[PDB]
Amino acid sequence: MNLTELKNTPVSELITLGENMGLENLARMRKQDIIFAILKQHAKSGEDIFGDGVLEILQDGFGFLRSADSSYLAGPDDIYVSPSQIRRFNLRTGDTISGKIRPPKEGERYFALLKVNEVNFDKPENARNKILFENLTPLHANSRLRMERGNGSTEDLTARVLDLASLIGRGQRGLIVAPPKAGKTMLLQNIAQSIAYNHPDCVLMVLLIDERPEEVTEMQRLVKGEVVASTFDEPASRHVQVAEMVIEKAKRLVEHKKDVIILLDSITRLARAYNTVVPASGKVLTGGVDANALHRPKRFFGAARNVEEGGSLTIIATALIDTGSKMDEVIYEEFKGTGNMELHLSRKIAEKRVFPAIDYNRSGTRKEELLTTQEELQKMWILRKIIHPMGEIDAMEFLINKLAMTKTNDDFFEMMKRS
Amino acid sequence: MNLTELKNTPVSELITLGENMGLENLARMRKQDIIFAILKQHAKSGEDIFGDGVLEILQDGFGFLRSADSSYLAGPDDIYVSPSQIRRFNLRTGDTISGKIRPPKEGERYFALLKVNEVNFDKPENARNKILFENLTPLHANSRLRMERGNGSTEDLTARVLDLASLIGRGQRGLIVAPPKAGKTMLLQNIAQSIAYNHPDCVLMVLLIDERPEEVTEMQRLVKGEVVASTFDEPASRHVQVAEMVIEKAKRLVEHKKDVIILLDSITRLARAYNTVVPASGKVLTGGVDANALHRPKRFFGAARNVEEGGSLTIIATALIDTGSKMDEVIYEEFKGTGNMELHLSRKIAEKRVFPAIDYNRSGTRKEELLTTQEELQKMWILRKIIHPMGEIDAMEFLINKLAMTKTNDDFFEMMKRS
Ligand SMILES: Nc1ncnc2c1ncn2[C@@H]1O[C@H](COP(=O)(O)OP(=O)(O)OP(O)(O)=S)[C@@H](O)[C@H]1O
Ligand SMILES: Nc1ncnc2c1ncn2[C@@H]1O[C@H](COP(=O)(O)OP(=O)(O)OP(O)(O)=S)[C@@H](O)[C@H]1O
Ligand SMILES: [Mg+2]
Ligand SMILES: [Mg+2]
């Protein structure tokens, strides 16, 4: 009996539990309050129950535990975590905590934590003796993270283009630069699909900032890995809170020699949120951004590394350009040289409805020698040499035609070399 | 026992000492906190405790002492320095201080020092009577700093091309102008390796600004001399204080008739940090960059000189062009006339995968007569007059082809003269 199976289910669970456990009148309140009523009525019986979620530390040890199913909304379903347990188990923000849960006594309205039985999907005894993320020596991307799905579909074409445009490996740090209406959302969809198909072992999690609710629903009903999204309805303070929770959870996961992958849409929106939430430092840059305001997002982008001890943390965040706002241009300029992978999308190609609309010459990755082999390295080199002269629209038309003629990337290289 | 000895040890050993010395949960916190805890527990035992590092003076004499291996980061393990011994010893910023340290008392969190045993690797009385860096009369470069490794390595052609392109001497002010994806980082790496090998006597310092952590790790693991870097995650004040500490330490070392070399990557990033940290003065140049904001970086570049009394301070700083940000080239034409050694890297040569990509015709050195003998100067003049007409890509291809079949620079000279 866990809190998860009573959260993800729809209002059919509401009506069934109302007609079964005999609650007075449900279906007039948020899912958090419905779940609160169900848990209160079930704890009234006294049957043993347990919970799970992601730990969070407030400014004074007021331990909270959020749920990733509900996108980390602060509601009644949040689980109390006492400071005594915090200093006993030595837990910090982002820890995945599951264990026995306690009904509340008089004076409080939150379930506390009876005892833990799983910390970060591991024994709590072994979780304490773990090296910090900040104390891990970074390296370059070693293991190639292939995106070719290999099922011979038609959407996979764009994924194939990725394997020809910019190589992506474990621990990379990439920026997808694109104007509005250029295919960012479907590119992220295809990247998530490729990660779920080719690399089921690595943890995939997608963060969405101030996106429309319809796009959130489309994202959450297609990707395999869990997805967290905050709409533009919520204030930017919640955007910052969600981003901090995501990055802390990723750090905690990668501290256990796990491969974490984060997809962010968008870094510009997160920078906006940080700019409009952080108090002014008295120094305002061009475009209306505070000098310290951009310090926080960079750290979020700075966590991408390839730990030598074990595991890696890859971050692929998209950036908005040509949006008519000078502040977006300032943010992109400040983030221009940070990433080690660049994927440039052009509205000129997308105008002709040729997808994916990737500026092949501008897009690329740095020191990909450590990622891929050498023979296909010069294959891609000669491909780049022959595709360099003609224009980007013609380049993409030629690329998609030649890729559709063949079946796989290796077959594509075979045909290109033999012809 | 040495605080620096503990700092140089890796992260993991915190367990090996801690479980043997009284710490029950020492894994989960920042490394400097472990160092603080262990050295507190050692001061509890009562044996004498050493300390050393670079001194720093605050706005009110509230002095601190940082460590090089920590990249001059303000941490709990920093050594407190009261104004009393500052006044008695006449210490100044950038001093190298070594000696006793004292456990903190009630109301103090930092470790004070009992008495100094060595100042600037010299007796405090002898180091007391030293001349200011400002009062030292500058000169031109006299002692040639040859970069030819001479072991016939697989990369020694880069150093050979460097010697044939721009002669480097002691106390020389150099600029490396290159676009992105040109080869700045490991060109500087080869420079540092050649300095460490050919000239072990001179102190080698490498300074990196807002660089990616992987590059920082590679630089730390590759160069023999000490290297300091601040990643782009850190704010601009961190960059400014790191650069100030480095330049002050270099001045203090060269005040003792020592040769110091500073490799800077990059002066553009340091100028950007100074621009975004210095308060506005009401005069904004093109590209949204203040006027006096460039005052501080030039002083950092203005310390390269050759001294009558002794010692030398060479600075090789790289600059970025063809980036797309207006302030970058604004800084570039705000730095052309300052440097007396120029090294241009071109994108076109790098696009042909021919390395090192050095624009030989545009690069050069002024007042090279005082650095080199007349015979090899005439040989280089003959090479320059036979290399001028053909283009940079062809020039570098020809230079690499001719240098590959020879062994040393002199052999190349006779090979071209006999033809
Ligand atoms: N691989 C693709 N195959 C077919 N159509 C595509 C593909 N990628 C993008 N499109 C089309 O491109 C258009 C825009 O797609 P989106 O990814 O939703 O745009 P966007 O990048 O999210 O930019 P916004 O959200 O409108 S600011 C739609 O008409 C899609 O059908
Ligand atoms: N002498 C050389 N031999 C072989 N490859 C080289 C040589 N010099 C440069 N390269 C290659 O050219 C690229 C230069 O890499 P970097 O030195 O890291 O570039 P950079 O000058 O640091 O500019 P950034 O930091 O990437 S914007 C890499 O792909 C290297 O493999
Ligand atoms: Mg979209
Ligand atoms: Mg570099």
From Swiss-Prot, chains A, B:
Pfam families per record: ATP-synt_ab (PF00006), Rho_N (PF07498), Rho_RNA_bind (PF07497)
One Gene Ontology CC term in the entry: membrane
Sequence segments annotated as region (RNA-binding 2): 284-288
Assembly and oligomerization: Homohexamer. The homohexamer assembles into an open ring structure.
Documented activity regulation: ATPase activity is inhibited by bicyclomycin and dihydrobicyclomycin.
Annotated region (RNA-binding 1), positions in chain: 61-66, 78-80, 108-110
Family the UniProt entry places it in: Belongs to the Rho family.
Keywords: ATP-binding, Helicase, Hydrolase, Nucleotide-binding, RNA-binding, Transcription, Transcription regulation, Transcription termination
Positions bearing the site annotation: RNA-binding 2: 326
Top-rank taxon, per record: Bacteria
Record-listed E.C. numbers: 3.6.4.-
Its biological purpose: Facilitates transcription termination by a mechanism that involves Rho binding to the nascent RNA, activation of Rho's RNA-dependent ATPase activity, and release of the mRNA from the DNA template. RNA-dependent NTPase which utilizes all four ribonucleoside triphosphates as substrates.
Entry keyword annotation includes Isomerase: no
Name of the protein in its database record: Transcription termination factor Rho
Listed HAMAP family: Rho (MF_01884)
Biological process according to GO: DNA-templated transcription termination
Cysteine pairings via disulfide bonds: none
